[PDB]
Amino acid sequence: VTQTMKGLDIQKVAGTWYSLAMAASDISLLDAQSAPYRVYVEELKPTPEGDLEILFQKWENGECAQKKIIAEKTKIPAVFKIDANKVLVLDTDYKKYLLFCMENSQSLACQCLVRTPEVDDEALEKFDKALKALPMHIRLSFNPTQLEEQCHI
Amino acid sequence: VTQTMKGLDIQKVAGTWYSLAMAASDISLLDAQSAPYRVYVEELKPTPEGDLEILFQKWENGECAQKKIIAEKTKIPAVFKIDANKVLVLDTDYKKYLLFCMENSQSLACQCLVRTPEVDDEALEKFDKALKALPMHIRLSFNPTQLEEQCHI
Ligand SMILES: CCCCCCCCCCCC(=O)O
Ligand SMILES: CCCCCCCCCCCC(=O)O
Ligand SMILES: [Cl-]
Ligand SMILES: [Cl-]
Structure with a gap:
């Protein structure tokens, strides 16, 4: 990811x-x-020290689990680390969309985050542009009803 | 599909x-x-009467099944019918790629077919262009190794 x-x-x-x-x-x-990478972001909680706490949903064992993880800062503002993985922030306008990617050490998943339960066509174009450079073999998108449900069901 | x-x-x-x-x-x-729409085309066998026999693979019950179906012609050369569905041929150059869609009566699945087990970037661009007009929420693509395996495993 560059x-x-x-x-x-x-x-x-x-x-x-x-x-x-x-x-x-x-x-x-x-x-x-x-x-493994089917994770639904709920809320981002930056810490004063500049770590990123993430609340997300994950489907485990026929149930939508509420989960929490800390992404630790690095020497690069746009790159965080997660234990179990690098999280890279590609692009954001803060008020509407955020593009990010997660990578282990050849597995890569990226998301288009939006602030509201709406299909933002401009944000999906930028998402699409950013992926043009990446070896992706699966893409999902969700409608507004799914966006308001636990685990996007 | 237009x-x-x-x-x-x-x-x-x-x-x-x-x-x-x-x-x-x-x-x-x-x-x-x-x-239901995870079908891997193997061979197209047009009939003299202008029907299209299709050989495809489908994963049923932990097994890759070899299957056969007849798509019946209509008054439109680019549109066929299948019992269980319309099949529409969007675009082909005959020698390298064919784009088609299947639709019931709101469910819609489209494929990019190629002649050889190779990632054809030009054909994927046209596939991508044709989908821009369609309400798609899942996209898959396969590497050359998967293309040469039963059910793309
Ligand atoms: C702005 C960055 C957004 C980062 C969200 C990453 C989601 C973390 C998922 C971790 C997977 C797991 O712990 O099961
Ligand atoms: C040029 C047209 C290509 C058409 C291929 C359609 C595949 C048919 C799949 C039917 C599904 C089923 O019978 O289970
Ligand atoms: Cl999309
Ligand atoms: Cl693609």
């Missing part, structure tokens, strides 16, 4: 987000409700 | 094809190996 947000101000990503689209290098990373 | 092949000569689609990419209006139409 696209990062220049000048990212992590404090201004605080608050509510919706996983409007997802994409991944391998079909099995997103194909089932219980696939 | 894109059909003007002047389609059904006889010249005869022979070998590979399902390089698939897309569908609903995630559950393509998300599992056993999803």
Whole structure:
């Protein structure tokens, strides 16, 4: 991944987000409700030290689980680390959309986050543009009804 | 779907094809190996009367089944009917790629077929252009190894 947000101000990503689209290098990373990278972002909670707490939903064992993880800052404002993985922030306008990618050490999943439960065509175009450079083999997007449901069911 | 092949000569689609990419209006139409529209085209066998016999693979009950169906001609050269559905041929150059869609009566799945087990970037661009007009919520594509395996496993 060679696209990062220049000048990212992590404090201004605080608050509510919706996983409007997802994409991944391998079909099995997103194909089932219980696939490893099928994660629905709910809320971003930046810390004063500049770590990113993430609230998300994940389907585990026929149930939509509410989950929490800390992404630790690095020397690069647009790149965080997660234990189990790099999180890279590609692009955001803070008020409407955020594009990000997660990568292990060849598995890659990226999302288009939006602030409201609405299909934002401009944000999906930028998402689409950013993926043109990436070896993606699965793409999902969700309608506004799914965006307001637990695990987008 | 409002894109059909003007002047389609059904006889010249005869022979070998590979399902390089698939897309569908609903995630559950393509998300599992056993999803209803997860069909891998193998061979097209036009009949003299101008019907289209289709050989395809489908994963049923932990097994890759070899299957056969007849798409009946209509008054439109680019549109066929299948019992269980309209099949529409959007675009083909006969020698390299064929784009088609299947629709019931709101469910819609489209494929990019190629002649050889190769990622044809030009054909994927046209596939991408044709889908811009369609309400797709899932896209898959397959690498050359998967293209040469039963059910693209
Ligand atoms: C602005 C960055 C958004 C990052 C969201 C990443 C989601 C973390 C998912 C971790 C997977 C898991 O813990 O099961
Ligand atoms: C040029 C047209 C290509 C058409 C291929 C259609 C595939 C048919 C799949 C039917 C589904 C089923 O019978 O289970
Ligand atoms: Cl999209
Ligand atoms: Cl594609």
